[PDB]
Amino acid sequence: PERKRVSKLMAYILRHSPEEFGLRPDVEGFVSLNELVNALKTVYPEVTEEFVREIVENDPKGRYEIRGDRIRARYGHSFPVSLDHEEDTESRFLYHGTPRRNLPSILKEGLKPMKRQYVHVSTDKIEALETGRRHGREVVLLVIDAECLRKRGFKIYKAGKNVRIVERVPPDCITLAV
């Protein structure tokens, strides 16, 4: 087994497309180390967990980080990740763009995590509207009360500049669907 090719595959998996290997990353970007070893074995069978730990320890640019049984990339992500687990308290309203077909379903049951464990929202209207415009047309803007989410037991985390991620958005926190 060669280290460099496995390291490039690790970077590709943990940075850009982890969903392609059946890997649901958390809010910080970590995945199960055993699950990552299982995913890496599907391409390089000669890969073990000790080899992955060696790659993480001897990486010259510090691309990887391991906490207990979880492993993540430290930078270069193509999808929103909340490094440092930095939480957002100074926000009173968040925004989310969604197609009109899902409008009654959302208004009835709120935003659900579905594929990933979390849900992406934005502190900006333009960003939410364009993100929803990528998932089809007839896009409406859901305004979300942030203090509702916090008082209902959901902490808002900073993933990008104007990107936030929560676990769920109950229908009670959706204040308006323009």
Swiss-Prot record:
This is Probable RNA 2'-phosphotransferase. The keyword Transferase applies. GO terms for biological process: tRNA splicing, via endonucleolytic cleavage and ligation. Belongs to the KptA/TPT1 family. Keywords: NAD, Transferase. The keyword Transmembrane does not apply. It comes from the Archaea. It is an enzyme of class 2 (transferase). One of its GO terms (molecular function) is tRNA 2'-phosphotransferase activity. Its EC number is 2.7.1.-. Pfam families: PTS_2-RNA (PF01885). Removes the 2'-phosphate from RNA via an intermediate in which the phosphate is ADP-ribosylated by NAD followed by a presumed transesterification to release the RNA and generate ADP-ribose 1''-2''-cyclic phosphate (APPR>P). May function as an ADP-ribosylase. Gene3D superfamilies: 3.20.170.30, RNA 2'-phosphotransferase, Tpt1/KptA family, N-terminal domain. The gene is kptA. InterPro entries: Ptrans_KptA/Tpt1, RNA_2'-PTrans_C, RNA_2'-PTrans_KptA, RNA_2'-PTrans_N.
